[PDB]
Antibody
């Protein structure tokens, strides 16, 4: 019933402001609970940032007090994060979460936020052609910022799929591969397409991966 | 601020056995007759998932294989029996006072039998070659343990400084890892050479496995 969903820009420049939204469905943010912002840094450390209660009272992490604002829109059942004067140290995945005095039950899916002066760039998608068991894939190259999502055959193919963590190249652009292993006999009968999405650049690419 | 210290930082546990993770607090997180301690599980691409609340209470929809105990400054998460899908990071957190803070996390690895990688090599696509760059990809599929060595050979010459690799998290079903290594060359350098080889060393292999192709 109760669901939280983050939204935000994905990329902001050093020194400017970050603004994020959490949309709450299936529960009124004025009824009960404290409504929290929590972030996770690249090396996986978690930090609680602040909350706004059902009554509108706020509490902040003292480490952020001078640049943090947590606000709400009760008519839209949304609450907000503002973080001023961001630096590269504010690059993180940002989460919204509920608290009722007993438990932190409900979390958003998270939104990835990169602080960088670099511009958004859409990926090029190249096939990794299959030449018992065969492997095939897609190389998703030269995009910025994170993240990309990859599925196979519009979600119909999930077994044996491995999508690897992106690496940052010397160019300052990310590259990743996604692969799947399938029966060799299926290569003449089953079509294989990787579905790549890069939301920051509004890039949606379906790339056929054909035997070569 | 209260500092939460987790121990150990990582552990490897066999299926059916017990995993024990400790969280120690710099001062008491117990007040008003409750212990404000929480345990989370997290897998990549996903939010933390609450397992245990107020030190000892099971979250709805979480298997009873998970249990929490302790009070004051000393807390323990127990997993028994350990299952394949428990491969994850685990975090403690308190809500005793502002600010709420988290432990540094513990990585649980599920022990399984040694498994050799299946190795695959992929030439750069013709589409990519149009762009002036060539990426050669080597895949090491479904191996255990995580330690593996990949070496790139171009016309029998050992490569250095022009490759990047990344490794998946442990598989939730078969407890294996997979690894991708990418060799990056200019189209010019790629066209200058013929033999492209990926050589894999892993304890599951009696001797290195080399997969290669000839450009053409």
């Amino acid at each position: 019933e109760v669901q939280l969903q983050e939204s935000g820009p994905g990329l902001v420049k050093p020194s400017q402001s970050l603004s994020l939204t959490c949309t709450v469905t299936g529960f009124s943010i004025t009824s009960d609970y404290a409504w929290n912002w929590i972030r996770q840094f690249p090396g996986s450390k978690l930090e609680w940032m602040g909350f706004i209660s059902y009554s509108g009272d706020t509490s902040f992490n003292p480490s952020l007090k001078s640049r943090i604002s947590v606000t709400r829109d009760t008519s839209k059942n949304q609450f907000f994060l503002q973080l001023n004067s961001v630096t590269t140290e504010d690059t993180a995945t940002y989460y919204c979460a509920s608290y009722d005095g007993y438990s932190f039950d409900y979390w958003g899916q998270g939104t990835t936020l990169t602080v960088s002066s670099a511009s958004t760039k859409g990926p090029s998608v190249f096939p990794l052609a299959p030449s018992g068991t065969a492997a095939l894939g897609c190389l998703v190259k030269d995009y910025f910022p994170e993240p990309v999502t990859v599925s196979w055959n519009s979600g119909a193919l999930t077994s044996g799929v491995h999508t690897f963590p992106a690496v940052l190249q010397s160019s300052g652009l990310y590259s990743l591969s996604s692969v799947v292993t399938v029966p060799s006999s299926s290569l003449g009968t089953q079509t294989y397409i990787c579905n790549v999405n890069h939301k920051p650049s509004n890039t949606k690419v379906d790339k056929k991966v054909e035997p070569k | 601020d209260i500092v939460l210290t987790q121990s150990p930082a990582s552990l490897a546990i066999s299926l059916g056995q017990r995993a024990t993770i400790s969280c120690r607090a710099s001062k008491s997180v117990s007040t008003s007759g409750s212990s404000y301690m929480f345990w989370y599980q997290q897998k990549p691409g996903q939010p933390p998932k609450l397992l245990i609340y107020l030190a000892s209470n099971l979250e709805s929809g979480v298997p009873a294989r998970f249990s929490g105990s302790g009070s004051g400054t000393d807390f323990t998460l127990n997993i028994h029996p350990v299952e394949e899908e428990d491969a994850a990071a685990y975090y403690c957190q308190h809500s005793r006072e502002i600010p709420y803070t988290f432990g540094g996390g513990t990585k649980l690895e599920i022990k399984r039998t040694v498994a050799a990688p299946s190795v695959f090599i992929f030439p750069p696509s013709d589409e990519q070659l149009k762009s002036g760059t060539a990426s050669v990809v080597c895949l090491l599929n479904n191996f255990y343990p995580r330690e593996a060595k990949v070496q790139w050979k171009v016309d029998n010459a050992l490569q250095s400084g022009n490759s990047q690799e990344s490794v998946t998290e442990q598989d939730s079903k078969d407890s294996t890892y997979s690894l991708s290594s990418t060799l990056t060359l200019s189209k010019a350098d790629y066209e200058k050479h013929k033999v492209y080889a990926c050589e894999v060393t892993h304890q599951g292999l009696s001797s290195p496995v080399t997969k290669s192709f000839n450009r053409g």
